[PDB]
Structures are given as structure tokens and as C-alpha cells.
Design an enzyme around this catalytic site. Structure first.
Site, mmCIF file in Angstrom:
data_model
loop_
_atom_site.group_PDB
_atom_site.id
_atom_site.type_symbol
_atom_site.label_atom_id
_atom_site.label_comp_id
_atom_site.label_asym_id
_atom_site.label_seq_id
_atom_site.Cartn_x
_atom_site.Cartn_y
_atom_site.Cartn_z
ATOM 1 N N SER A 14 -51.461 17.199 -3.049
ATOM 2 C CA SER A 14 -50.053 17.411 -2.878
ATOM 3 C C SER A 14 -49.273 17.994 -4.245
ATOM 4 O O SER A 14 -49.737 19.100 -4.324
ATOM 5 C CB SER A 14 -49.441 15.856 -2.617
ATOM 6 O OG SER A 14 -50.249 15.256 -1.741
ATOM 7 N N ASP A 53 -49.534 18.814 8.381
ATOM 8 C CA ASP A 53 -49.200 17.959 7.249
ATOM 9 C C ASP A 53 -48.086 17.122 7.337
ATOM 10 O O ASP A 53 -46.836 17.673 7.491
ATOM 11 C CB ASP A 53 -49.343 18.944 5.997
ATOM 12 C CG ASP A 53 -49.079 18.003 4.729
ATOM 13 O OD1 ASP A 53 -50.006 17.650 3.993
ATOM 14 O OD2 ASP A 53 -47.921 17.798 4.415
ATOM 15 N N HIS A 72 -51.922 13.260 5.465
ATOM 16 C CA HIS A 72 -51.425 13.844 4.019
ATOM 17 C C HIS A 72 -52.530 13.358 3.067
ATOM 18 O O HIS A 72 -52.587 12.137 2.781
ATOM 19 C CB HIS A 72 -49.994 13.309 3.801
ATOM 20 C CG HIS A 72 -49.474 14.158 2.636
ATOM 21 N ND1 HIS A 72 -49.379 15.546 2.430
ATOM 22 C CD2 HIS A 72 -49.002 13.909 1.400
ATOM 23 C CE1 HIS A 72 -48.914 15.944 1.321
ATOM 24 N NE2 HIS A 72 -48.613 14.953 0.457
#
Ligand SMILES: COc1ccc(CNC(=O)[C@@H]2CCCO2)cc1
Length: 341
Positions: free
Chosen positions: A145, A244, A288
Site C-alpha cells: 500500500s 483494489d 487490498h
């Protein structure tokens, strides 16, 4: 267990002035080094950063960090959990700079907080060299991320640093997981303003070739994968779910024809930006992050798992039966049966 070491140069600090650091587990029989960048959003002004300091303080300070952390996923030393790099030297770098790993600004009488993510990476690399990194053959800079965006902003600087220090044999590579975002139109209005305010607040730094393309006032563009990736010289493998969850959150998506078309077009655009990325893994799933999840071995694209695709990448650095570019073509989340439940 990886063991905590706080930085010896105590002028390289988390947001609140406390020392930054790293967690390390050495493998003396291996010449491979994995340095993983943690994620966790960011803050972009005084009031926003003060709120984070109240309820996400471990992402702003080392004062409460534990002395150990368990390695999971690509950071696991167990072959059954990590078919790719189980014998490597393992490093976890905590995210305590709230600047998507871009900052180079100290606390002072005019700055309540320090934003030193880019310098924290450089200092960890410098101190690891005396603990065995000087003997490495491969340095893999990985991240998830915000840490995945941080790989894209920092992999070439690490390559340059090691070259200028006199270590030309260490091959520096990047692995960016769930850090590849599109600055698209939202489904509903509440956008890029947060990252534009932040780079000014942090004195954030972006790779040199990309800053020269977009020039002053437009460096925020280099935080978007499809715009900074063509400028990079180090090899970078891109992992990105086509649907996502952090992308859809920002897009204000939480099914009528309007939403169906919106979602299908997001997946098509994402697939398009990866078409000239030769090492990539992009399944048609709503999710994610993946690389430090314990069950990261489970998902497959066209019959190939992510650990296999990374092994094929190592070999490439086309191979019969061992692909490196793996992007789903089906157009709806969980049209791939191996998606996580
Ligand atoms: C529609 O526009 C956006 C979509 C997703 C994001 C999420 N990504 C980030 O906020 C940071 C800055 C850029 C790379 O990560 C931001 C804007």
C-alpha cells in the site's frame, strides 16, 4: 522473530522526534536481502496529523514499539509459507513518517512534526551494510500500500546510494504491492488535493527523472504508478488487484447499470496501464495488500501463483512454462475462482 534495532543516527526520526528503526532476522548462509516498507495512509496538515497522533501513534513514534515482530508471508522463513525467498535475510521497516516514504524534513521551531521517510530508508541501508549487507548479491526493496508507492519513489535512490558508496555488485530491485493507483473520476463526489497538500507539507522528494518531466508544482504526479514507473531504471515487479479496495474507497464506491459500467471500466483502465509492465501480477479480485499475508500462496493467475511468478522473475534476471506477466482479462470481481474469500 525479527528483532528491533533503533537507528544509531538519532537525528533520523519518526514524526514526533523519537528514533526510527528496523526489525532484522539474519540468515548467514544467504546472499539475498529483503527490505519491506510498511503501509498505513498518511497525514497532510497540522490538524490531520494531530488526529493521527491520538489514535494511530505507532505510525508516528517508536516509543511503544515491541522488541520483536513475527515474519509472515514473504517475510516468513518457513518453506511451506514462503516458497520464494524463505532462506533470505529479512528486514521489516516500520512506517512512522506518515509521508508515503517521501519526506526529508526535520522537526524544528517552525515544524511540529518531522517527515523523514526517504532518509529513514537511506539510513537503514547504511547501517545494515556493517551487519552483512556488504556481501549481498540481491537487495529486494518491497512494500505494501503506502509502502508499495514508497518502493516506486525510492528504489532508484537506493541503487544510486550503493553505487556511490562503492558496492557495484549488489543488484537492487523493487517489489510494489497495492501501491498502483489511478487518479480517475469518482463514482460520486464527496481528491488529489490531499497528496498535493502533503508534498508541500513534508518537503517530499520524488525520483529525479520524473521530477524533470513534470517540473515544479506538478511533482504530485510521480506518486501515481503509471506515471513514475516508465522513468525508473531498476527492475520493479508490480502486484495490484484489479478492483483494489483503497482505490474504490477514494472513488466513493460502496448493482445498477451505472455502477456496473463504472466498475468494469476501472478494471479495464487498470489492465491497460499494466500492458507494458513486463513483470506484474494483477488478479480480478476485490481486496487490498497480499505479500505479507500468511495465505499469499493461494491466489493464481492463469494457473500461476504469486510465489512462482516471483521465482520466474528471478530466473529472467521468455521462459517455457515460467511466466512473469500475469494479468486477468475477465471483467468482474471474483471472476477468478482463486480470489480470497
Ligand atoms: C481518484 O484519485 C485517487 C484514487 C486513489 C488514491 C489513493 N492513493 C493515495 O492517496 C496515495 C497518493 C497517490 C498514491 O497513494 C488517491 C487518489
Amino acid at each position: 522473530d525479527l528483532r528491533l534495532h533503533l537507528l544509531l543516527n538519532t537525528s533520523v526520526t519518526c514524526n514526533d522526534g523519537s528514533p526510527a528503526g528496523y526489525y532484522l532476522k539474519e540468515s548467514r548462509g544467504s546472499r539475498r536481502w529483503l527490505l519491506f516498507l510498511e503501509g498505513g495512509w498518511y497525514c497532510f496538515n497540522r490538524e490531520n496529523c494531530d488526529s493521527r497522533y491520538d489514535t494511530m501513534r505507532r505510525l508516528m513514534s517508536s516509543r511503544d514499539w515491541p522488541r520483536t515482530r513475527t515474519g509472515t508471508g514473504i517475510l516468513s522463513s518457513q518453506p511451506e509459507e514462503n516458497p520464494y525467498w524463505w532462506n533470505a535475510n529479512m528486514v521489516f521497516i516500520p512506517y512512522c513518517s506518515s509521508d508515503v516514504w517521501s519526506g526529508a524534513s526535520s522537526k524544528s521551531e517552525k515544524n511540529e512534526y518531522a517527515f523523514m521517510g526517504a532518509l529513514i530508508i537511506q539510513e537503514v541501508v547504511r547501517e545494515l551494510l556493517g551487519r552483512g549487507l556488504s556481501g549481498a548479491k540481491v537487495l529486494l526493496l518491497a512494500g505494501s500500500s503506502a509502502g508499495g508507492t514508497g518502493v516506486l519513489l525510492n528504489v532508484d535512490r537506493v541503487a544510486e546510494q550503493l553505487e556511490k558508496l562503492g558496492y557495484p555488485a549488489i543488484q537492487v530491485r523493487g517489489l510494489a504491492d497495492s501501491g498502483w493507483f489511478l487518479d480517475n473520476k469518482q463514482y460520486r463526489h464527496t481528491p488529489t488535493e490531499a497528496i498535493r497538500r502533503g508534498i508541500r507539507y513534508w518537503n517530499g522528494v520524488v525520483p529525479e527523472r520524473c521530477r524533470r518531466q513534470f517540473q515544479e508544482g506538478e511533482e504530485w504526479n510521480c506518486f501515481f504508478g503509471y506515471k513514475v514507473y516508465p522513468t525508473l531504471r531498476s527492475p520493479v515487479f508490480v502486484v495490484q488487484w484489479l478492483f483494489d479496495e483503497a482505490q474504490l474507497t477514494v472513488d466513493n464506491v460502496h448493482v445498477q447499470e451505472g455502477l456496473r459500467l463504472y466498475i468494469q471500466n476501472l478494471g479495464r483502465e487498470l489492465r491497460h496501464t499494466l500492458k507494458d509492465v513486463p513483470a506484474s501480477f494483477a488478479p480480478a479480485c476485490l481486496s487490498h495488500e497480499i505479500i505479507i499475508r500468511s495465505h499469499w500462496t493461494d491466489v493464481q493467475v492463469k494457473g500461476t501463483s504469486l510465489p512462482r511468478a516471483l521465482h520466474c522473475w528471478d530466473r529472467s534476471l521468455p521462459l517455457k512454462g515460467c511466466p512473469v506477466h500475469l494479468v486477468d482479462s475477465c471483467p468482474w470481481p471474483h471472476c477468478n475462482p482463486s480470489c480470497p474469500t
